[PDB]
Design a protein around this ligand. Structure first.
Ligand SMILES: Nc1ncnc2c1ncn2[C@@H]1O[C@H](COP(=O)(O)OP(=O)(O)NP(=O)(O)O)[C@@H](O)[C@H]1O
Ligand SMILES: Nc1ncnc2c1ncn2[C@@H]1O[C@H](COP(=O)(O)OP(=O)(O)NP(=O)(O)O)[C@@H](O)[C@H]1O
Lengths: 466, 466
RNA sequence: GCGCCGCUGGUGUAGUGGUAUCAUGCAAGAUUCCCAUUCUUGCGACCCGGGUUCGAUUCCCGGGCGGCGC
RNA sequence: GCGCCGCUGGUGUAGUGGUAUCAUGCAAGAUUCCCAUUCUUGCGACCCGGGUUCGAUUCCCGGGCGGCGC
């Protein structure tokens, strides 16, 4: 609830700073520091594993420059003296004007033919694109909530309009979500907690494709740690072809984070009629159709124009909501604020910490660091004048998921055992430094929870050496 | 050597297509398809693991828009009627002009204070940035070699000018590299194959920092599969403060791929004098200095201006060189071209293949797919009218590292054994489908080579069922 | 940039002032049963516009893009 | 955008027409020896420019940026 506090923490530690502060900044442009960049990357990687990996989506890398004709066709050029897109010129100035793309989606549309081709002309397939987009907003505001350059992650799901049904829907059908349907909106009611499947077999949500995507969108948002309770999907009123967008409860109110938008025969077609190049899938007929025109003209393939589900992920806003949702303040010392980053998307998975500024602590810190690096675990080595707890508070601020402390009992006892300390709970268990990185991986990957670790291992009574 | 062939393959299969081909394209702008995007991502991930992970570098996410004052200070604005940067306007047009950044480096410079701060004010530290950059080239050409929007990956290494020596240099000191020093250039000679260490303790390369970075740059380029033989580091003549850039032998000649440039007191300072904000590290004195001025003014900290090593990685050109270097054509059927993508950066690590369009092959294809996905291995399921070999040739084109074929002996024998087939060699071994994904991971991660697999497992004599 | 020749299925090409050849490739059914098998069948293209024209993919003017010369 | 109040170490602030208070934080040495210990010491700032002025962080004009009203 305390954005003053949260923000102070985020700024002091360079999660994200205002861009070009040195030159007195610029509105709506923000640079992400080390910790924020680590978090952002983790979120993105998680998104790739949760969507691209899970659905065999075809990620592509289109460019951010986009010539005026393209956006005329799309209807952005007309959608706005001056207009809300960054306008520039390509080449020797003059006759080829252009813009910085307002969304990553269009690239997937002007490549539909080669993408379908790659999918052996078959349907239904999905192609995605993660990348930055630029709106030249008159009044940017609210930190990351409305900026001028942000990172989108879009998925275009091309599916035969007829075959709108999903094989894997049963994997999300039994989820309990908050749904803010259109009726409930105009009928003055709040959102409702439905089992997903039911919401589909009550016609609230058209089909099991839309449903499926909603379910996994939900699962993803909660995976990275957006509170389930401050997350609803709000159907679009008489305001879309059938949008349903995921919003979160922030201090700036309910905010759009992911826009899942089922457009039918839309962008593709406008592009086709523009360029005169046809964009279509062909589906074989299972019963060929002789058409006696006047001779007999037999048809073997129906010329399908696919429907498209367009989930647009706002990385910026999702990141911010992970902030506001996972920002806590400790009992007692209220100077110690922490970030309950879910383990898998933590900026740093571990912290190598000695007990005190002592020399006989060096080799275990070095060897642990190197061993975590071998094991590929992102870690912060912190070793200063600071008391153990100062370093704890320093590491908790940036939401380091767990913390290894190497101590005297680690040095002065035969099985070299150091301690692992859980961020959120502050509690700790003791294990041999030889296997610790494995525990930290296993932790960072959900296969074991902290409860799992507390179970499998001795707790921590005390320390007996000096 | 055959760029007609190579290119045909790259284009047909949408590694990268010319941008906005539908609207008749645009020069110097290229979109990367599924396979190219997969490869690109793999390269980037490998770069992060090889540099950021290995050196605790501080990756940040700066923006691509950059106001005119910044680039005036940097001296890009002056560096060129019209000039070679994409110019746009930020906000209500008018009085705040700007550009699309010509490099990602500057962001790391205008944030130096917070980055140093994060590093506890200590030296020497490194911060990186992966991201796109834009040159408005008059004549873009040669596919990816010279474009208008590309992906850079830059590292700024800030180090005290005095303490220019590297603890880990002994890890690269014993490498054998091709060095094209300045003398050899003006003295009409070719490059020379030196042991790295020697080249440093002969003064050819100033110091062991520069050296270290050269060594790991080399290791990285060869990791992703640039031929060692078509790779040299060319020192800058009387042409830099001490540049040494890695170039590769392509069909377009020797091309710059990575620009490692040791600038001294350069960018930081110009920025500081511009904004009047000081950019400096402080180093404690180990013997305080009382300075009798006229009273006694004791100094405890010397005000250091760090030197900066600037390796600039050209993702585009590196990608292209991986293409030209790893593009082969099979013995016999010269329609079958393949890509010897090193296992770790392959676009797809595996291919689930049945033997023929048969029904009793389905469940093993599905279960294998799902099992690889569980095991997080990027794979292509290919199951068509096609003969086994047509699918082989189809999968070899895109450089799928290995290929599982499920057959009759897999179905009609008690331990369910399918075959693993090595791309480059076409040879194959047989293992139970229950443990196959582990072998494919282990393969994709260097811990086991193909020789390792051929050793640990039975070969492949034949198939006995139908 | 400027100069030179160019553009026809996804790819490689034939050809023409009355809307198109062959190969490949992709799809379907068979046929295969470990390395682009084979037969049948199906899908798919004249870069964009302007000019002249009854009519242009063809001829001419202009843009786009590519192969190359500095 | 327009309107409103604002800007001083990294962060939070005091104050003034003669260049700066306190807290924090970061650093060093000690002191601790498992949760911002304590003492000493050190580092670091008036958003930018213009005007008036002997002189501006202070006063005024203009830009930048932020907190908010539509
Ligand atoms: N100025 C901005 N700052 C940060 N994120 C933005 C900004 N503008 C758009 N987005 C993101 O872009 C996504 C979709 O863009 P947008 O077109 O506005 O929504 P949509 O899917 O078209 N329909 P809707 O979101 O209801 O307008 C949203 O989910 C946002 O998270
Ligand atoms: N038009 C381009 N297309 C693709 N890559 C480019 C292009 N321009 C620059 N690069 C990449 O950018 C990197 C460095 O840019 P550049 O400034 O030209 O070199 P550098 O490190 O400054 N010194 P030098 O490369 O010798 O000019 C190179 O390694 C290239 O790979």
């Amino acid at each position: 609830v305390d954005r003053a506090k949260m923000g102070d923490t985020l700024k002091r530690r360079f999660f994200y700073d205002q861009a070009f502060a040195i030159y007195g900044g610029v509105s709506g442009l923000y640079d992400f520091g080390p910790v924020g960049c680590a978090l952002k990357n983790n979120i993105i990687q998680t998104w790739r594993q949760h969507f691209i990996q899970e659905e065999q989506i075809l990620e592509i890398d289109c460019t951010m420059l986009t010539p005026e004709p393209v956006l005329k066709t799309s209807g952005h050029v007309d959608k706005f003296s001056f207009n809300l897109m960054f306008k520039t010129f390509i080449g020797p100035g003059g006759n080829m004007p252009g813009y910085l793309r307002p969304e990553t989606a269009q690239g997937i549309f002007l490549n539909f033919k080669r993408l379908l081709e790659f999918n052996q002309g078959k349907l239904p397939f999905a192609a995605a694109q993660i990348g930055n987009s630029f709106r030249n907003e008159i009044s940017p505001r609210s930190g990351l909530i409305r900026v001028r350059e942000f990172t989108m992650a879009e998925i275009e799901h091309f599916v035969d309009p007829s075959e709108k049904d999903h094989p894997k829907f049963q994997n999300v059908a039994d989820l309990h979500l908050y749904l803010y349907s259109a009726k409930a909106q105009v009928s003055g009611q709040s959102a409702r907690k439905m089992r997903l499947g039911d919401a589909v077999e009550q016609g609230v949500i058209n089909n099991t494709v839309l449903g499926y995507f909603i379910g996994r969108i939900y699962l993803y948002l909660t995976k990275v740690g957006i509170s389930p309770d401050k997350l609803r999907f709000r159907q679009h009123m008489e305001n879309a072809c059938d949008c349903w967008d995921a919003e979160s409860k922030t201090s700036y109110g309910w905010i759009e984070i992911v826009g899942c938008a089922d457009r039918s025969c839309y962008d593709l077609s406008c592009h086709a009629r523009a360029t005169k190049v046809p964009l279509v899938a062909e589906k074989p007929l299972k019963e060929p159709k002789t058409v006696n025109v006047v001779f007999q003209k037999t048809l073997y393939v129906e010329e399908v124009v696919p429907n498209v589900i367009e989930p647009s992920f706002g990385l910026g806003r999702i990141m911010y909501t992970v902030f506001e949702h996972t920002f806590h303040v400790r009992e007692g010392d209220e100077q110690r604020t922490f970030f309950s980053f879910p383990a898998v998307v933590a900026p740093f998975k571990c912290s190598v910490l000695p007990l005190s500024q002592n020399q006989e602590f060096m080799p275990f810190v070095k060897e642990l660091s190197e061993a975590l690096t071998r094991h590929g675990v992102s870690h912060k080595v912190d070793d200063s004048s600071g008391s153990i707890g100062r370093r704890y508070a320093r590491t908790d601020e940036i939401g380091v998921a767990f913390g290894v402390t190497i101590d005297f009992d680690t040095v002065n006892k035969t099985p070299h055992t150091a301690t692992l300390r859980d961020r959120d709970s502050m509690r700790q268990i003791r294990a041999e430094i030889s296997e610790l990185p494995s525990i930290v991986q296993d932790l960072a990957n959900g296969n074991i929870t902290w409860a799992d670790v507390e179970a499998r291992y001795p707790l921590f009574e005390g320390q007996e050496t000096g």
